């Protein structure tokens, strides 16, 4: 089970391209219930890891480990 606070911290350790890749993976897998905010006008995303399913969280964690 992914530690969500370590995930959130580790996500900020990615470079710009890899963090965009996180945004890509999340928007491609998102449903309304995962409470992802995407202000399309402002080009900003707000990810609530606590609303993501465990498989996506695991994919994000492995992605962080692979790219740091």
């Amino acid at each position: 089970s992914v530690d969500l606070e370590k995930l959130a911290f580790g996500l900020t350790k990615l470079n710009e391209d890899d963090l965009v890749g996180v945004v890509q993976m999340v928007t491609d897998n998102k449903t309304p219930e995962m409470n992802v905010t995407n202000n399309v006008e402002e080009g900003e995303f707000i990810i609530d890891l606590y609303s993501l399913p465990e498989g996506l969280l695991k994919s994000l964690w492995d992605y962080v480990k692979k790219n740091t």
Binding site: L4, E5, A8, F9, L11, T12, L19, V20, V22, V23, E42, G43, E44, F45, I46, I47, D48, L49, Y50
Partner: peptide, 12 residues
Amino acid sequence: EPKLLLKINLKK
């Protein structure tokens, strides 16, 4: 109860 929200601002 603490929650870390991750805000990501993209290039426009």
